[PDB]
Design a binder for this molecule. Structure first.
Ligand SMILES: [Mg+2]
Ligand SMILES: [Mg+2]
Ligand SMILES: [Mg+2]
Ligand SMILES: [Mg+2]
Ligand SMILES: [Mg+2]
Ligand SMILES: [Mg+2]
Ligand SMILES: [Mg+2]
Ligand SMILES: [Mg+2]
Ligand SMILES: [Mg+2]
Ligand SMILES: [Mg+2]
Ligand SMILES: [Mg+2]
Ligand SMILES: [Mg+2]
Ligand SMILES: [Mg+2]
Ligand SMILES: [Mg+2]
Ligand SMILES: [Mg+2]
Ligand SMILES: [Zn+2]
Lengths: 95, 211, 64, 125, 43, 25
RNA sequence: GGUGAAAUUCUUGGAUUUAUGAAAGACGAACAACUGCGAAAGCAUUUGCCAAGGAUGUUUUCAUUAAUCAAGAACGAAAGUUGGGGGCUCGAAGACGAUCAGAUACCGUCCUAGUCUCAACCAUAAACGAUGCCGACCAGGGAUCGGCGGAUGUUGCUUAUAGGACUCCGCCGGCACCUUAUGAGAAAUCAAAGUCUUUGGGUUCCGGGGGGAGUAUGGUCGCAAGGCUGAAACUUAAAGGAAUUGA
RNA sequence: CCGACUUUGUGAAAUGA
């Protein structure tokens, strides 16, 4: 019983994909099988933006954003609810 | 415990807009642990935004060396530059390409250093192609062009004027108007200047760049 | 010397807790009426209650 | 007058380090664990609150009034996300009365790192 | 110093001190360690 | 991995049979 | 430091933390894709040299020189074996700390061979598209990679055009992808797994219930682990595939 | 192996008196 056309990963034209480390557990999963999100998160949340912009020394300053690109494996993704088991039909769309 | 530490006045060379970058502190001069030459090489990391009182340049962290101290006032000469971490990550996104280069340059006062330059390709407006990639040969042509341009830009009289070029992004705005015939190259910069081997002391030479 | 501050429960954001025991609310400071800080309260609370708040810094976060 | 607040805010602890503009001298250094009894509450956000207010008091005891934050995760080949204490300590160090100079995330990201701990199949707990 | 015995054996520690008088300093002189060299110590 | 470790059992028992045969050689 | 929590551990011989410099050796983030190259294995920093290669273009040449292939031959990940070099990180073995009824494991600390380079072997992987290779026809579409041809309309380029970047159209050749049966099939599913009881284009390898068993033996390659070739007795009525309802 | 005295002169700073 085959569950996915691409196998769960998107490798076509290759035979080998260099692997990466899960950010949670450090399981080794190939780069193009790993649930990759690029999250860009403010240093603070919106209860802590004015209390730092009324304490920034120089007026007109803008907060940075944590740009980082986290990698996860399938186990840590399912466990963290980054992704969910979708129905047989709904499983097929990519948006 | 902190009653034996006295502050000093950190001030930057005269090629900068504003000076008096900050205050540091040393243990007062004993013998053997004399304070003056005891440290001698504090490397400070002052952003170019509050050395030129601007905010378009909240990137470009300029890194300064202390090279000699003068009576409760420590002199300083330029040492390097780099992006603040946050800038460069915001510069790199999917569906484009990143181009980088590096080159040793030796300037007229015998200063060896390294230039790391970076660029990214544009989307020309009306583009419906979802990506803007080069073809890995245009990449190498423009990397060669970047190295050639930067060598020709540099090899000039000193770091004095060489930072008079670093400040207004001379290398940047003069890269594309030489290499856009191959790609647009938006957000060309010089991500880093790493001073490799500082030559000597030259009391006399410090004191015109810094006053 | 932390002096207790009073705040008014402007709107109840939810009823959190593992067992469903803690209300999770927004308190608006009476003393300086621009400080909206979000806290966990125990027991029945409805809108507008003046609330005795020993420590100010400790706040909840959405679905704490 | 400025300092540099090397906030090493990882999991498992949060370290607040205040140094002069050149990094060669520690003005004051309180951890989240110095202020709690529990080896598990040494990483709670509250530890960062009181450990930050203690730094603020010691800095006003001494002369600096504004402070360049340098937020930092563990870095290296570990998580790049600053731990629970980062935002909390920043809130405390802002609201306790002090001025914050320029915010920046300086957590070491390698160009590419050595083997990371755990083995192939990772921490399977 | 290793001599003799109804079996062949050294009979005492084969690592001798640096100052041991000539004629006693036979064996492994002033050895910091012994056994097969593994790991960093084999650098 | 029942099949794998079965394979490994037979592998061990087969080195053991070769060990016995070079005795009886 | 570490975890849900702890300790072994390091620590007033100043650990962790901060900055500066050095050294060593590994890895080449982000850009990085339903993307490229390769016979498969596999291949990501720069520049140079070396030789090779598909595709495209061609009013060049030769003219059947071709397809697939028992014997035979090359390459063949990781692990492994022998011997120099290196000894960063990680780490089978091993030792400890916890957990537990026990815990030879999961968790954590130290750590050997190993991980990297070279010389020499080994010859297997879920070596996967679980789909041999060559060829023909059959359905639709937009993407995208490479080359090429045709179109104006602008460039932060260009002594002006050309070119290069972008847009439109079309041919090949790739990896794919999306809808649909008029098809197939045990079905999942497949536009190639289709053009099969209305059965034949060519070619190689291979299976005949489940075990026993990839085992015994014999041979043969290998230093060794191993590899290649490989039964029978006897046992058994099911083993298995796809999908459906439930639990 | 180690300390002191000795061959063993010249002058400079830092801590102790
Ligand atoms: Mg291919
Ligand atoms: Mg493979
Ligand atoms: Mg004897
Ligand atoms: Mg005995
Ligand atoms: Mg220290
Ligand atoms: Mg490519
Ligand atoms: Mg790279
Ligand atoms: Mg096989
Ligand atoms: Mg097979
Ligand atoms: Mg095959
Ligand atoms: Mg095309
Ligand atoms: Mg095409
Ligand atoms: Mg059979
Ligand atoms: Mg099966
Ligand atoms: Mg079934
Ligand atoms: Zn994981």
């Amino acid at each position: 019983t085959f569950k996915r056309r691409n196998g769960g990963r998107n490798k076509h034209g290759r035979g080998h994909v260099k692997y990466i480390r899960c950010s949670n557990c450090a399981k080794c999963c190939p780069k193009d099988k790993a649930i990759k999100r690029f999250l860009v998160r403010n240093i603070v949340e919106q209860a802590a933006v004015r209390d730092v912009q009324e304490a920034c020394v120089h007026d007109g300053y803008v907060l940075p954003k944590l740009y980082a690109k986290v990698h996860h494996c399938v186990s840590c993704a399912i466990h963290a609810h980054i992704v969910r088991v979708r129905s047989r039909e709904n499983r097929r769309n990519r948006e | 415990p902190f009653t034996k530490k006295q502050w000093y006045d950190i001030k930057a060379p005269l090629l900068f807009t504003s000076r008096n970058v900050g205050k540091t502190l040393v243990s007062r001069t004993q013998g053997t642990k004399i304070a003056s030459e005891g440290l001698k090489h504090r490397v400070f990391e002052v952003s170019l935004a509050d050395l030129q009182n601007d905010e378009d340049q909240a990137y470009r962290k300029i890194r300064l060396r202390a090279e000699d101290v003068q009576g409760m006032n420590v002199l300083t000469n330029f040492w390097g530059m780099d992006f603040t971490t946050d800038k460069l990550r915001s510069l790199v996104r999917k569906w484009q390409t990143l181009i980088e280069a590096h080159v040793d340059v030796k300037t007229t006062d015998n200063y060896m250093l390294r230039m790391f330059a970076i660029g990214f390709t544009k989307r020309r407006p009306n583009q419906v192609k979802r990506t803007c990639y080069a073809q890995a040969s245009q990449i190498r042509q423009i990397r060669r062009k970047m190295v050639e341009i930067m060598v020709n830009q540099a090899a000039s009289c000193d770091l004095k004027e060489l930072v008079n070029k670093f400040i207004p992004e001379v290398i940047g705005k003069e890269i594309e108007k030489a290499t856009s015939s191959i790609f647009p190259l938006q957000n060309v910069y010089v991500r880093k200047v790493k001073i490799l081997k500082a030559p000597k002391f030259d009391l006399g030479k410090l004191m015109e760049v810094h006053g | 010397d932390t002096q207790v501050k009073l705040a008014v429960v402007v709107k109840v954001m939810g009823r959190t807790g593992s067992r469903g025991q803690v209300t999770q609310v927004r308190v608006k400071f009476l003393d300086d009426q621009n400080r909206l800080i979000m806290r966990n309260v125990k027991g029945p609370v409805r809108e507008g209650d003046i609330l005795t708040l020993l420590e100010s810094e400790r706040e909840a976060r959405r679905l704490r | 007058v400025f300092g540099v607040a090397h906030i090493f805010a990882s999991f498992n602890d949060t370290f607040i380090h205040v140094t002069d503009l050149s990094g060669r001298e520690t003005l004051v250094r309180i951890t989240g664990g110095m202020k709690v009894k529990a080896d598990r509450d040494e990483s709670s956000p509250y530890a960062a609150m009181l450990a930050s207010q203690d730094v603020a008091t010691r800095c006003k005891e001494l002369g600096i009034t504004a402070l360049h934050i340098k937020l930092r995760a563990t870095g290296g080949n570990k998580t790049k996300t600053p731990g629970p204490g980062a935002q909390s300590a920043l809130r405390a160090l802002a609201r306790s009365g002090m001025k914050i100079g320029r915010i920046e995330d300086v957590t070491p990201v390698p160009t590419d790192s050595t083997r990371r701990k755990g083995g192939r199949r990772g921490r399977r707990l | 110093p290793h001599g003799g015995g109804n079996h062949q054996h050294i009979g005492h520690a084969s690592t001798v001190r640096r100052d041991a008088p000539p004629g006693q300093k036979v064996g492994l002189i002033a050895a910091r360690r012994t056994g097969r060299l593994r790991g960093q110590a084999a650098a | 991995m029942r099949a794998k470790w079965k394979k490994k059992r037979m592998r061990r028992l087969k080195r053991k049979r070769r060990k016995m045969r070079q005795r009886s050689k």
